[PDB]
Amino acid sequence: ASVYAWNRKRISNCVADYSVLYNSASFSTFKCYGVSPTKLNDLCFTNVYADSFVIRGDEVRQIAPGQTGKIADYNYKLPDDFTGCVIAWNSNNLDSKVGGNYNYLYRLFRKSNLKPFERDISTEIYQAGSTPCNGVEGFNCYFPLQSYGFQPTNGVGYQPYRVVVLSFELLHAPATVCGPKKSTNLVKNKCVNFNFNGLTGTGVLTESNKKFLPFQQFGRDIADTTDAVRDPQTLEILDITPCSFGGVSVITPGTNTSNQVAVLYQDVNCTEVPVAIHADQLTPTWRVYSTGSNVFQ
Amino acid sequence: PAYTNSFTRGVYYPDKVFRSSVLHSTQDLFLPFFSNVTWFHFDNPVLPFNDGVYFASTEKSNIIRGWIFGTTLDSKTQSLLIVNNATNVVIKVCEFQFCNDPFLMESEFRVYSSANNCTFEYVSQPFKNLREFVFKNIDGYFKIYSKHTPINLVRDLPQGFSALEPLVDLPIGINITRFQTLLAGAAAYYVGYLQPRTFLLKYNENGTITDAVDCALDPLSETKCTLKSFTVEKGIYQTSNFRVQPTESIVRFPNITNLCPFGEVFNATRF
Amino acid sequence: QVQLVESGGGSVQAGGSLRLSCAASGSISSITYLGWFRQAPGKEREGVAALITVNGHTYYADSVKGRFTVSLDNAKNTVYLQMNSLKPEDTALYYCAAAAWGYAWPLHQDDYWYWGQGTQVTVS
Amino acid sequence: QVQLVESGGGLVQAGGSLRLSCAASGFPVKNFEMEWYRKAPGKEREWVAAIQSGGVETYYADSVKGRFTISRDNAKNTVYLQMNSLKPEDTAVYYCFVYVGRSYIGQGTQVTVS
Amino acid sequence: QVQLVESGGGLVQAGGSLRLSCAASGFPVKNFEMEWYRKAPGKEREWVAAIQSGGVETYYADSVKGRFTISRDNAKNTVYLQMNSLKPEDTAVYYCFVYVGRSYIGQGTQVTVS
Ligand SMILES: *[C@@H]1O[C@H](CO)[C@@H](O)[C@H](O)[C@H]1NC(C)=O
Ligand SMILES: *[C@@H]1O[C@H](CO)[C@@H](O)[C@H](O)[C@H]1NC(C)=O
Ligand SMILES: *[C@@H]1O[C@H](CO)[C@@H](O)[C@H](O)[C@H]1NC(C)=O
Ligand SMILES: *[C@@H]1O[C@H](CO)[C@@H](O)[C@H](O)[C@H]1NC(C)=O
Ligand SMILES: *[C@@H]1O[C@H](CO)[C@@H](O)[C@H](O)[C@H]1NC(C)=O
Ligand SMILES: *[C@@H]1O[C@H](CO)[C@@H](O)[C@H](O)[C@H]1NC(C)=O
C-alpha cells in the first residue's frame, strides 16, 4: 500500500501467529507500544485493524507517541497512549529497482497537522502565498506528490524500512483476530488436571477402547458426568477415569491390650500409596506405615 | 392446499453431548408429531419464518438451489443470501434488491442487481435424494442441521426414524420474518414450523437416537415421559395436575351515590 | 525497576582482548533486548552491539564487524561483550543498556533505556 | 478494557487558546467523577479541574479559576478541556484522570506556552 | 528560520568540471541528513548524492557512481558537490534537500552540459 492510500482494512475471524516474526532475523525497528512484545501472542485485544507502507528509514524513530516530525505530521501519526506494534524491517532486496524505485509517491505538504489514525488523500496542491495557482505550475504551486528515491546504492538509513501497524484500539465490538494459544504435551495413566479446548476437569487420562462418530468432540454417561474426550492435534479418542482417593483402615485392639498397629488401604491399588499420602511430609513414624516387608491384597 | 402429516420424522440432537444407553428428557424448539406440512412445485412463493423452519425435499436432479432470507429484501434492510451451484457454496449478507420474479441454457442469473454495503461473505464446499434440514435463528446464531438419506418414491414423505446433526453456526445477528426459496422440470419441497415442546430421547450404545416419545401427544407417551421408560408395565400412574382458569374477573363495589355539592361550585354566577 | 552494574574494564595494549560484563537485577523476565553503547571522546554516543534475549539473534556495526562478539548468560543474568583484536580508536566509555519494549537496530539514545554506570576501556 | 487517550495539544504563545480532549473506552462517563492533572518540568503533579459524576458541579485549582473551562461529552465518551488566557507558568503535560474501580492515567499530551 | 540557496552553477562542455554549493542556516549539518536532487527537462526529479549526519558514509545514484564526489564543510555551514566527467544527460536544475521538521527546497541552480 501507499501512504496516500493505506486502507483501513478489516482482516477478521482468523488467527495470526506472531512468534514467527521474531525468529526470522531481519527486523530493524520492531517496537510494541503499550503491551509487551513477549506477551503479544498469548493475550490479545479487539480492533485489530492493520496498516502498511514502506516508509523511508531516516525518520522511523519519529514514529512515537508524543513526537512530531515529518512522517508524524504529514504522513502518519500515532496518538498518545498507543497500544499495538509498529514493526519495521529491511526492504533492500525487492523494493529497489534500477534508477530509483518510484512506485510509492508521498504527501509532502498539508495545510494543517494530521489527526492521528487518519488516511490522508488529496489531489489539490499546497497553498503558501496569496496568489492562486491557475493550473499551470508556477512559483508558489508546490506539488506535494514527490518521489522517494530508493536506489540499491542507498544505505540502511536511506533504504525503506517496511512498517506494518497492528493497531489495537478499544471499541464496543467482539474481538476477531488474536495470537495463538500455546499447548503442552499429553500424558497418560496419571491423575492430572487437564486444560483442553473448552473443558477442564480432574481425572486420569487413560487409553480408550470405544470410538465415536466424527461429530462428537466429547461424551458423557448416565447422570451427566464426562467420561470421554478427543485430542485436537492427533484426533484420537480418549477415556478418562476418576482419581485415586479413599480411606485408611488402621487396626487398634483397644488401649489396654496392645499398642502397635497394622494398616489397610481401602479401594486403592496399593503400589502408588507413598505418592498418595504425604509420607515425605509427615513423621518417620508415619513413614513406616506406607510400606513394609509384608504386602497382602 | 396439499397438506400431509409427519410420521415421527425430524428429531435432532439438542447438543453435541454423547450419551450412551440412557433415557434423557430434553426441551428445545422441536417439531410436534403428526403436524401438517405443505407441498408445492412454475411456483416460487415467499413464506414466513415463524420461530423455526423444518425442511425436507425429495429430488432426482438439483432443481432446488438455495434460499433467500431477510425482512424487507429491499435497499434499506440487509438480507441474507445462500446460493448453491456447481463447485462451491456462497453465503453472504449484503444490501440486496431482489427481483420481482427471481429465477436462475447451462447458466442464468437474474435474481438481484445490487452490490452496495456488503458486510459478510463466506465460501464453503457443498426421485432419488431426500435432503432434510432445520432452519433456525436463535439469539443471532443461525443453526443448520442436516441429514442426507436416499428415498425412491414420488408420492409423499416416507416414514422411519433418523437424526439431524448440526453443521454451521454463524453469527448473523439480523432479524428475520420472511424467507423465499429459490430454484432454477418440477420438484417437491416440504416446509414445517417448529414449536416449543418437551421430548424424551432414547440413546443406543453408540449415542444415536433410535426412538423418541413426545410429552404432549397422548397420555401413554405422557406416562413414558413421567416414568422415564419406553415399555410401561400394567398399572395406574399419576402424571400431572390441572386447574380451571378464571374467565371474567368481575368487579363489585358499593353504591357510590353520595353527591357532593360540586354543582354549586361549578355552576354559579358569582364565585 | 531494572538495574545494571557494569564491570570488566581496564587498560590494554593494541591488539589485546577484553571481556566486559553487565549484571542485571530487578525485572529480569521483562528484558527483551540488550545493547552496547559507546561514547568516544569528541563524538556522540553510538551503537556497537546488539542481542535479543528471546531469540539469541545478534547484530553488529560495521566498525566492529569481525572483531567483536556478544554473548548471553541467563544463569547469572549477565551479558558479556568479548572485544578481541583491539585498536586505539576504540578507546571510549562503554555502556550496557536494557530494553523491555522490544528490539531496535541500530541503537539510538532517545528511546527508553535502563542505563548502566559505565566503565573505562583504554587501548594504546 | 479501560483506557484514556489524550489529543489536541500543540505549541501556543502567551495568551493563546487551545482545546484538549480525553477520549475514554470501556466505561460510560455518566457514572464517574472526572479530573485533570498536569506535570510541569521540575514541578510536582498538580490537580487542574473536576466535574462530579452527576455532571452538575464544577471545580478548579486556585491559580486557574476564572480562566480555564472544563466540558464533558457523554455521547462521544470524551472529556474536553478549554484554554483561555494562557501563561507560560502552565507549561506542562496534561493528563486526564478518572477513578473507575482503580484510577487510570493516560500518557498525556505536551502543551507549551511560549 | 531554515533556508537553503544554491549557487556555483554554470554551463560547461562535454568533459568539464564544476563545483556547486548549498548555503545552510538555522541548523547544524552534523545532526541531520541532507540530500541532492536534480530536475532534467522532460524528466522527473532524481536523487543525486547524499551525506549522512555522522559524516562516515558517502552515497551516489546508480548512473553517477565513480564520477561524482560529494563533500561537506562543517565550519562554513555549506555542503558542496564536485562534478567530474560530465555527459549531456546530466543537464538539470539541481536542488539541495534537508528534512528538519519540514522538507526545505532551495530555489535551484542551473547546470547545463552541451
Ligand atoms: C483388656 O480389657 C479387656 C476387657 O476389659 C480384657 O478382656 C483383656 O484381657 C484386657 N487385656 C489386658 C492385657 O489386660
Ligand atoms: C494394581 O496395579 C498393578 C501395577 O500395574 C497391577 O499389576 C495389578 O493388576 C493391579 N491390581 C488391581 C486389582 O487393579
Ligand atoms: C391436516 O390437514 C387436514 C386437511 O387440511 C386435516 O383434516 C387434519 O386434521 C390436519 N391435521 C391436524 C393434526 O389437524
Ligand atoms: C451501510 O449500512 C450501514 C448499516 O447501519 C449504514 O449505517 C450506512 O449508512 C450504510 N451506507 C450506505 C452508503 O448505504
Ligand atoms: C428486528 O426488529 C425488531 C422489532 O422492530 C427489533 O427489536 C430488533 O432490534 C431488530 N433487529 C435488528 C438486528 O435490527
Ligand atoms: C353546569 O350546568 C350545565 C348546564 O345546565 C351542565 O351541562 C353541566 O353539567 C353543569 N356542571 C356540572 C359540574 O354538573
Side-chain angles (χ1 to χ4, degrees), chain A, chain B residues 1-34 36-43 45-77 79-97 99-115 117-124 126-138 140-150 152-204 206-213 215-271, chain C, chain D, chain E:
Chain A
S2 294
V3 68
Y4 47 79
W6 55 274
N7 52 2
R8 183 69 69 193
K9 44 193 288 180
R10 177 67 262 184
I11 309 299
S12 67
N13 292 319
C14 49
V15 289
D17 69 316
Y18 293 100
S19 288
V20 67
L21 267 73
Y22 316 125
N23 64 34
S24 177
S26 84
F27 280 175
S28 72
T29 307
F30 167 65
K31 197 57 175 61
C32 285
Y33 288 107
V35 69
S36 287
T38 305
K39 323 153 181 162
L40 187 75
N41 287 264
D42 49 349
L43 57 93
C44 70
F45 311 97
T46 187
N47 299 122
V48 178
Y49 292 164
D51 316 305
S52 164
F53 189 49
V54 296
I55 201 59
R56 184 184 153 179
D58 56 339
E59 287 160 345
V60 179
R61 303 172 190 88
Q62 280 186 356
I63 299 302
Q67 170 62 39
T68 177
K70 166 64 59 175
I71 318 293
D73 202 6
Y74 299 136
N75 301 82
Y76 158 73
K77 175 60 168 291
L78 289 174
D80 307 326
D81 200 15
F82 164 69
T83 72
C85 297
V86 294
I87 308 106
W89 60 87
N90 296 314
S91 53
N92 183 32
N93 304 323
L94 72 164
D95 282 332
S96 190
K97 73 172 183 274
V98 58
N101 208 61
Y102 308 131
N103 267 266
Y104 318 100
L105 271 77
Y106 73 108
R107 186 211 277 258
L108 194 40
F109 302 125
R110 184 173 173 86
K111 330 288 159 298
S112 80
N113 303 339
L114 291 172
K115 297 173 184 175
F117 288 158
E118 178 184 334
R119 168 202 180 253
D120 48 350
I121 184 64
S122 278
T123 305
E124 270 284 278
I125 58 178
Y126 191 58
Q127 166 95 334
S130 300
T131 59
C133 285
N134 283 344
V136 175
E137 300 278 321
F139 81 108
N140 46 359
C141 280
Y142 300 141
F143 203 68
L145 299 189
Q146 212 261 330
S147 302
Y148 290 165
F150 289 155
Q151 283 101 335
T153 77
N154 278 325
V156 67
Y158 282 147
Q159 272 294 299
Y161 279 166
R162 194 166 294 194
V163 288
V164 290
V165 178
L166 270 299
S167 182
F168 290 160
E169 293 94 341
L170 291 90
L171 216 54
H172 44 274
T176 61
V177 167
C178 295
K181 267 81 64 179
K182 300 288 97 176
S183 47
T184 65
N185 47 2
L186 58 89
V187 309
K188 287 194 210 162
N189 205 0
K190 199 256 176 184
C191 165
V192 61
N193 209 326
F194 40 82
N195 175 218
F196 292 149
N197 62 6
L199 74 164
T200 58
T202 59
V204 184
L205 297 176
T206 51
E207 192 274 331
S208 56
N209 48 356
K210 57 177 70 72
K211 60 182 71 66
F212 283 169
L213 282 72
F215 78 106
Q216 294 90 15
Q217 290 302 103
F218 67 100
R220 303 174 202 265
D221 67 340
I222 296 92
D224 199 80
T225 315
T226 317
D227 53 348
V229 68
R230 185 207 285 279
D231 48 353
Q233 302 195 1
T234 304
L235 281 74
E236 311 297 332
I237 192 65
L238 188 151
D239 292 356
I240 66 169
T241 317
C243 293
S244 302
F245 72 105
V248 173
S249 297
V250 174
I251 296 89
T252 179
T255 304
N256 77 310
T257 297
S258 165
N259 206 8
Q260 54 263 20
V261 296
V263 60
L264 289 148
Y265 290 158
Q266 72 176 356
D267 55 52
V268 171
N269 192 295
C270 48
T271 57
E272 56 259 39
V273 297
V275 180
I277 62 170
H278 312 294
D280 46 352
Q281 270 76 72
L282 299 170
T283 81
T285 315
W286 278 79
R287 197 227 71 75
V288 301
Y289 291 110
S290 67
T291 183
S293 66
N294 44 3
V295 171
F296 186 47
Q297 175 85 237
Chain B
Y3 292 90
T4 56
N5 75 312
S6 57
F7 309 100
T8 74
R9 164 79 60 180
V11 177
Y12 58 95
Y13 310 97
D15 44 1
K16 293 142 181 304
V17 175
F18 164 87
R19 312 174 165 93
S20 186
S21 296
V22 65
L23 302 175
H24 190 237
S25 164
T26 60
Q27 199 269 338
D28 192 275
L29 294 174
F30 288 95
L31 61 90
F33 284 161
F34 312 102
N36 276 319
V37 297
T38 180
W39 166 50
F40 291 163
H41 301 80
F42 195 76
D43 289 329
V46 65
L47 293 91
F49 182 76
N50 294 336
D51 301 343
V53 166
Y54 158 72
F55 195 104
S57 88
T58 317
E59 265 177 311
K60 172 66 90 157
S61 72
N62 308 320
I63 303 283
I64 201 162
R65 287 298 164 194
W67 309 266
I68 313 167
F69 304 89
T71 308
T72 74
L73 296 96
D74 191 74
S75 297
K76 62 94 175 180
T77 54
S79 301
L80 198 148
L81 183 141
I82 296 160
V83 171
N84 176 35
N85 48 1
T87 177
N88 50 3
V89 298
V90 173
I91 294 95
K92 43 186 286 186
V93 54
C94 300
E95 190 76 54
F96 282 104
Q97 191 269 328
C99 169
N100 200 5
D101 273 344
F103 63 95
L104 270 75
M105 183 278 288
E106 303 283 333
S107 282
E108 185 91 29
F109 201 90
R110 264 214 63 216
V111 62
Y112 73 102
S113 50
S114 186
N117 217 328
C118 288
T119 317
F120 182 78
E121 203 272 333
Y122 170 68
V123 181
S124 166
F127 280 173
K128 274 303 289 174
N129 198 1
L130 172 63
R131 319 197 178 103
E132 315 180 3
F133 309 126
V134 164
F135 284 3
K136 54 194 289 190
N137 183 74
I138 307 301
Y141 269 102
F142 211 101
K143 319 188 174 49
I144 305 299
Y145 295 78
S146 84
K147 186 92 182 307
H148 286 54
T149 186
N152 45 4
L153 61 84
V154 286
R155 32 157 172 90
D156 47 359
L157 61 84
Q159 307 177 355
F161 203 88
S162 293
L164 293 164
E165 298 147 348
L167 269 296
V168 176
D169 202 13
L170 202 43
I172 303 298
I174 69 175
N175 62 12
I176 177 165
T177 70
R178 309 190 271 143
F179 89 105
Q180 179 180 4
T181 300
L182 199 44
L183 307 101
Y189 63 94
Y190 290 164
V191 165
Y193 287 147
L194 301 191
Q195 219 271 327
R197 290 284 300 273
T198 294
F199 268 80
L200 177 83
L201 297 172
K202 170 184 177 183
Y203 287 91
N204 70 326
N206 295 11
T208 184
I209 300 144
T210 54
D211 209 341
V213 292
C215 309
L217 176 73
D218 50 351
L220 186 55
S221 55
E222 176 74 31
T223 301
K224 281 175 202 166
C225 285
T226 51
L227 288 190
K228 290 181 175 64
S229 167
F230 264 62
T231 53
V232 160
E233 302 279 344
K234 177 168 86 54
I236 182 168
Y237 300 117
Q238 185 172 0
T239 62
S240 74
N241 300 271
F242 75 107
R243 191 163 72 256
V244 188
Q245 295 301 113
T247 53
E248 268 90 7
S249 302
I250 61 180
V251 173
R252 290 309 278 231
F253 264 121
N255 293 357
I256 305 297
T257 73
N258 213 351
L259 204 69
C260 283
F262 268 88
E264 60 92 20
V265 70
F266 270 94
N267 270 319
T269 185
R270 195 254 188 274
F271 272 27
Chain C
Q1 293 177 335
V2 170
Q3 304 288 333
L4 301 191
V5 173
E6 171 68 29
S7 64
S11 65
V12 76
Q13 60 93 32
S17 53
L18 277 174
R19 183 177 178 178
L20 302 170
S21 74
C22 182
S25 69
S27 309
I28 308 299
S29 51
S30 68
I31 297 178
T32 64
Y33 176 57
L34 296 167
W36 286 95
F37 282 85
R38 159 169 92 167
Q39 180 180 33
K43 279 192 59 66
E44 292 286 327
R45 175 153 63 178
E46 295 289 327
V48 164
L51 188 136
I52 306 173
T53 70
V54 191
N55 296 138
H57 292 345
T58 62
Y59 302 93
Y60 302 96
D62 290 1
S63 48
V64 293
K65 200 201 289 193
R67 319 190 287 112
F68 273 31
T69 305
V70 62
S71 72
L72 184 69
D73 205 313
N74 292 112
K76 308 152 197 62
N77 292 330
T78 294
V79 76
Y80 297 103
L81 184 62
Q82 182 71 45
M83 314 180 308
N84 298 353
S85 297
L86 288 185
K87 45 197 60 179
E89 294 92 355
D90 303 331
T91 302
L93 282 165
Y94 279 78
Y95 296 88
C96 64
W101 274 256
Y103 40 81
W105 180 77
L107 290 168
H108 204 278
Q109 207 176 184
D110 291 359
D111 286 342
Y112 201 93
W113 299 97
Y114 304 101
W115 294 120
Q117 86 272 7
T119 185
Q120 180 60 234
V121 169
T122 305
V123 192
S124 44
Chain D
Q1 208 202 42
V2 173
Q3 185 175 329
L4 312 164
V5 285
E6 297 94 342
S7 302
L11 188 151
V12 294
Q13 64 180 13
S17 72
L18 210 64
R19 171 168 168 270
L20 308 174
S21 64
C22 174
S25 45
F27 71 102
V29 292
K30 269 191 182 177
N31 287 333
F32 300 101
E33 298 186 353
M34 187 66 204
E35 280 185 336
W36 309 70
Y37 278 65
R38 69 193 165 170
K39 264 195 164 183
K43 307 267 293 171
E44 299 173 348
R45 189 175 283 185
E46 55 180 23
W47 168 73
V48 184
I51 300 172
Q52 290 178 333
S53 73
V56 191
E57 291 182 351
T58 52
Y59 297 102
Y60 301 92
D62 287 331
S63 46
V64 298
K65 274 202 314 164
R67 44 175 289 166
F68 284 177
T69 296
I70 186 168
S71 63
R72 299 195 97 229
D73 201 1
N74 302 332
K76 294 181 182 176
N77 194 0
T78 317
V79 182
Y80 306 97
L81 189 63
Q82 180 59 64
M83 295 298 102
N84 280 304
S85 279
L86 277 171
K87 298 183 183 196
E89 51 205 90
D90 314 305
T91 309
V93 185
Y94 283 78
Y95 315 94
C96 58
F97 264 76
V98 67
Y99 322 118
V100 187
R102 40 153 292 186
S103 79
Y104 283 45
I105 317 169
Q107 279 318 294
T109 316
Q110 171 77 49
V111 172
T112 180
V113 181
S114 184
Chain E
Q1 201 200 40
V2 186
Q3 186 185 334
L4 300 176
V5 62
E6 297 93 348
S7 305
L11 191 148
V12 295
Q13 64 177 11
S17 73
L18 197 62
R19 174 170 171 267
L20 306 175
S21 63
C22 168
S25 165
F27 76 105
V29 297
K30 266 193 180 182
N31 288 336
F32 291 93
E33 297 165 348
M34 50 65 57
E35 281 177 339
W36 270 93
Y37 277 70
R38 77 191 172 169
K39 265 198 164 184
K43 309 269 293 170
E44 302 167 347
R45 192 178 283 179
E46 193 270 334
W47 167 80
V48 181
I51 314 168
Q52 286 182 331
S53 69
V56 192
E57 301 175 351
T58 48
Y59 289 132
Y60 312 97
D62 275 294
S63 46
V64 294
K65 281 177 70 176
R67 42 176 287 171
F68 281 1
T69 296
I70 190 173
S71 59
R72 54 167 61 187
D73 200 4
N74 296 332
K76 286 181 178 176
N77 203 1
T78 318
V79 193
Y80 306 97
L81 181 68
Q82 175 70 66
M83 302 265 158
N84 289 302
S85 284
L86 283 168
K87 300 187 183 199
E89 293 180 353
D90 312 307
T91 304
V93 181
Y94 277 74
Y95 311 94
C96 59
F97 270 76
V98 65
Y99 293 87
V100 188
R102 185 70 75 91
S103 70
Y104 294 101
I105 318 170
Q107 293 320 294
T109 183
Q110 174 69 223
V111 172
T112 307
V113 182
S114 185

mmCIF file with all atom_site columns, all heavy atoms in Angstrom, chain B residues 76 102 180-181 197 203 218 227 233:
data_model
loop_
_atom_site.group_PDB
_atom_site.id
_atom_site.type_symbol
_atom_site.label_atom_id
_atom_site.label_alt_id
_atom_site.label_comp_id
_atom_site.label_asym_id
_atom_site.label_entity_id
_atom_site.label_seq_id
_atom_site.pdbx_PDB_ins_code
_atom_site.Cartn_x
_atom_site.Cartn_y
_atom_site.Cartn_z
_atom_site.occupancy
_atom_site.B_iso_or_equiv
_atom_site.pdbx_formal_charge
_atom_site.auth_seq_id
_atom_site.auth_comp_id
_atom_site.auth_asym_id
_atom_site.auth_atom_id
_atom_site.pdbx_PDB_model_num
ATOM 1  N N   . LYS B 1 76  ? -33.091 -0.959  1.861  1.00 0.00 ? 76  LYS B N   1
ATOM 2  C CA  . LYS B 1 76  ? -32.972 -0.284  3.144  1.00 0.00 ? 76  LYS B CA  1
ATOM 3  C C   . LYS B 1 76  ? -32.746 -1.222  4.328  1.00 0.00 ? 76  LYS B C   1
ATOM 4  O O   . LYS B 1 76  ? -32.400 -0.738  5.412  1.00 0.00 ? 76  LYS B O   1
ATOM 5  C CB  . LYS B 1 76  ? -34.200 0.628   3.372  1.00 0.00 ? 76  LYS B CB  1
ATOM 6  C CG  . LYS B 1 76  ? -35.599 -0.020  3.457  1.00 0.00 ? 76  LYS B CG  1
ATOM 7  C CD  . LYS B 1 76  ? -36.070 -0.338  4.875  1.00 0.00 ? 76  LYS B CD  1
ATOM 8  C CE  . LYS B 1 76  ? -37.495 -0.856  4.883  1.00 0.00 ? 76  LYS B CE  1
ATOM 9  N NZ  . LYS B 1 76  ? -37.951 -1.174  6.263  1.00 0.00 ? 76  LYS B NZ  1
ATOM 10 N N   . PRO B 1 102 ? -37.633 -13.850 -9.202 1.00 0.00 ? 102 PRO B N   1
ATOM 11 C CA  . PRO B 1 102 ? -36.272 -14.393 -9.114 1.00 0.00 ? 102 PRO B CA  1
ATOM 12 C C   . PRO B 1 102 ? -36.203 -15.826 -9.626 1.00 0.00 ? 102 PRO B C   1
ATOM 13 O O   . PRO B 1 102 ? -36.917 -16.710 -9.148 1.00 0.00 ? 102 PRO B O   1
ATOM 14 C CB  . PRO B 1 102 ? -35.957 -14.318 -7.612 1.00 0.00 ? 102 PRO B CB  1
ATOM 15 C CG  . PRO B 1 102 ? -37.075 -13.506 -6.996 1.00 0.00 ? 102 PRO B CG  1
ATOM 16 C CD  . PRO B 1 102 ? -38.254 -13.748 -7.873 1.00 0.00 ? 102 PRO B CD  1
ATOM 17 N N   . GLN B 1 180 ? -37.559 -16.899 1.306  1.00 0.00 ? 180 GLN B N   1
ATOM 18 C CA  . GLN B 1 180 ? -38.034 -17.189 -0.037 1.00 0.00 ? 180 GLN B CA  1
ATOM 19 C C   . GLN B 1 180 ? -37.112 -18.221 -0.659 1.00 0.00 ? 180 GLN B C   1
ATOM 20 O O   . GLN B 1 180 ? -35.895 -18.025 -0.729 1.00 0.00 ? 180 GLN B O   1
ATOM 21 C CB  . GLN B 1 180 ? -38.100 -15.925 -0.910 1.00 0.00 ? 180 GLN B CB  1
ATOM 22 C CG  . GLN B 1 180 ? -38.570 -16.178 -2.351 1.00 0.00 ? 180 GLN B CG  1
ATOM 23 C CD  . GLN B 1 180 ? -38.622 -14.918 -3.209 1.00 0.00 ? 180 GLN B CD  1
ATOM 24 O OE1 . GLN B 1 180 ? -38.243 -13.834 -2.769 1.00 0.00 ? 180 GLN B OE1 1
ATOM 25 N NE2 . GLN B 1 180 ? -39.097 -15.063 -4.443 1.00 0.00 ? 180 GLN B NE2 1
ATOM 26 N N   . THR B 1 181 ? -37.709 -19.314 -1.102 1.00 0.00 ? 181 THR B N   1
ATOM 27 C CA  . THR B 1 181 ? -36.976 -20.433 -1.657 1.00 0.00 ? 181 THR B CA  1
ATOM 28 C C   . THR B 1 181 ? -36.731 -20.180 -3.149 1.00 0.00 ? 181 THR B C   1
ATOM 29 O O   . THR B 1 181 ? -37.604 -19.699 -3.876 1.00 0.00 ? 181 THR B O   1
ATOM 30 C CB  . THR B 1 181 ? -37.779 -21.714 -1.389 1.00 0.00 ? 181 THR B CB  1
ATOM 31 O OG1 . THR B 1 181 ? -37.931 -21.871 0.026  1.00 0.00 ? 181 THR B OG1 1
ATOM 32 C CG2 . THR B 1 181 ? -37.075 -22.957 -1.895 1.00 0.00 ? 181 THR B CG2 1
ATOM 33 N N   . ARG B 1 197 ? -41.527 -27.679 22.619 1.00 0.00 ? 197 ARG B N   1
ATOM 34 C CA  . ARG B 1 197 ? -42.055 -28.916 23.172 1.00 0.00 ? 197 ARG B CA  1
ATOM 35 C C   . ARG B 1 197 ? -40.998 -29.577 24.042 1.00 0.00 ? 197 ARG B C   1
ATOM 36 O O   . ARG B 1 197 ? -39.812 -29.242 23.987 1.00 0.00 ? 197 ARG B O   1
ATOM 37 C CB  . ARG B 1 197 ? -42.508 -29.879 22.069 1.00 0.00 ? 197 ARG B CB  1
ATOM 38 C CG  . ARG B 1 197 ? -43.757 -29.437 21.335 1.00 0.00 ? 197 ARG B CG  1
ATOM 39 C CD  . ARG B 1 197 ? -44.987 -29.671 22.190 1.00 0.00 ? 197 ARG B CD  1
ATOM 40 N NE  . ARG B 1 197 ? -45.127 -31.082 22.518 1.00 0.00 ? 197 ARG B NE  1
ATOM 41 C CZ  . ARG B 1 197 ? -45.746 -31.966 21.749 1.00 0.00 ? 197 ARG B CZ  1
ATOM 42 N NH1 . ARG B 1 197 ? -46.348 -31.605 20.630 1.00 0.00 ? 197 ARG B NH1 1
ATOM 43 N NH2 . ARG B 1 197 ? -45.764 -33.244 22.113 1.00 0.00 ? 197 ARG B NH2 1
ATOM 44 N N   . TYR B 1 203 ? -31.308 -43.264 23.767 1.00 0.00 ? 203 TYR B N   1
ATOM 45 C CA  . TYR B 1 203 ? -29.996 -43.378 23.151 1.00 0.00 ? 203 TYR B CA  1
ATOM 46 C C   . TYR B 1 203 ? -29.589 -44.843 23.090 1.00 0.00 ? 203 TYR B C   1
ATOM 47 O O   . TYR B 1 203 ? -29.968 -45.633 23.960 1.00 0.00 ? 203 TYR B O   1
ATOM 48 C CB  . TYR B 1 203 ? -28.957 -42.579 23.934 1.00 0.00 ? 203 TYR B CB  1
ATOM 49 C CG  . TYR B 1 203 ? -29.065 -41.080 23.777 1.00 0.00 ? 203 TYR B CG  1
ATOM 50 C CD1 . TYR B 1 203 ? -29.843 -40.326 24.650 1.00 0.00 ? 203 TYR B CD1 1
ATOM 51 C CD2 . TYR B 1 203 ? -28.392 -40.419 22.755 1.00 0.00 ? 203 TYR B CD2 1
ATOM 52 C CE1 . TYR B 1 203 ? -29.940 -38.950 24.516 1.00 0.00 ? 203 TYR B CE1 1
ATOM 53 C CE2 . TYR B 1 203 ? -28.483 -39.044 22.608 1.00 0.00 ? 203 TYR B CE2 1
ATOM 54 C CZ  . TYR B 1 203 ? -29.260 -38.319 23.492 1.00 0.00 ? 203 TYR B CZ  1
ATOM 55 O OH  . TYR B 1 203 ? -29.355 -36.954 23.352 1.00 0.00 ? 203 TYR B OH  1
ATOM 56 N N   . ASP B 1 218 ? -50.110 -38.045 23.431 1.00 0.00 ? 218 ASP B N   1
ATOM 57 C CA  . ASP B 1 218 ? -51.168 -38.857 24.016 1.00 0.00 ? 218 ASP B CA  1
ATOM 58 C C   . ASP B 1 218 ? -50.760 -39.185 25.448 1.00 0.00 ? 218 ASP B C   1
ATOM 59 O O   . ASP B 1 218 ? -49.587 -39.017 25.808 1.00 0.00 ? 218 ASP B O   1
ATOM 60 C CB  . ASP B 1 218 ? -51.435 -40.123 23.167 1.00 0.00 ? 218 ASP B CB  1
ATOM 61 C CG  . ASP B 1 218 ? -50.183 -40.889 22.823 1.00 0.00 ? 218 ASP B CG  1
ATOM 62 O OD1 . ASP B 1 218 ? -49.084 -40.379 23.081 1.00 0.00 ? 218 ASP B OD1 1
ATOM 63 O OD2 . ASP B 1 218 ? -50.304 -42.012 22.293 1.00 0.00 ? 218 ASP B OD2 1
ATOM 64 N N   . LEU B 1 227 ? -42.463 -41.582 33.677 1.00 0.00 ? 227 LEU B N   1
ATOM 65 C CA  . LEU B 1 227 ? -41.820 -42.729 34.300 1.00 0.00 ? 227 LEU B CA  1
ATOM 66 C C   . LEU B 1 227 ? -40.381 -42.923 33.850 1.00 0.00 ? 227 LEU B C   1
ATOM 67 O O   . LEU B 1 227 ? -39.655 -43.672 34.516 1.00 0.00 ? 227 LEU B O   1
ATOM 68 C CB  . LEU B 1 227 ? -42.613 -44.002 34.000 1.00 0.00 ? 227 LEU B CB  1
ATOM 69 C CG  . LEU B 1 227 ? -43.954 -44.200 34.704 1.00 0.00 ? 227 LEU B CG  1
ATOM 70 C CD1 . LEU B 1 227 ? -44.455 -45.612 34.466 1.00 0.00 ? 227 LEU B CD1 1
ATOM 71 C CD2 . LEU B 1 227 ? -43.849 -43.911 36.190 1.00 0.00 ? 227 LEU B CD2 1
ATOM 72 N N   . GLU B 1 233 ? -45.313 -50.812 32.215 1.00 0.00 ? 233 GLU B N   1
ATOM 73 C CA  . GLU B 1 233 ? -45.962 -52.010 32.717 1.00 0.00 ? 233 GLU B CA  1
ATOM 74 C C   . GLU B 1 233 ? -47.407 -51.719 33.099 1.00 0.00 ? 233 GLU B C   1
ATOM 75 O O   . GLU B 1 233 ? -47.843 -50.568 33.164 1.00 0.00 ? 233 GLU B O   1
ATOM 76 C CB  . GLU B 1 233 ? -45.203 -52.573 33.917 1.00 0.00 ? 233 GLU B CB  1
ATOM 77 C CG  . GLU B 1 233 ? -43.752 -52.925 33.625 1.00 0.00 ? 233 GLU B CG  1
ATOM 78 C CD  . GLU B 1 233 ? -43.596 -54.272 32.940 1.00 0.00 ? 233 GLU B CD  1
ATOM 79 O OE1 . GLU B 1 233 ? -44.556 -55.071 32.956 1.00 0.00 ? 233 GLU B OE1 1
ATOM 80 O OE2 . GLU B 1 233 ? -42.508 -54.532 32.387 1.00 0.00 ? 233 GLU B OE2 1
#
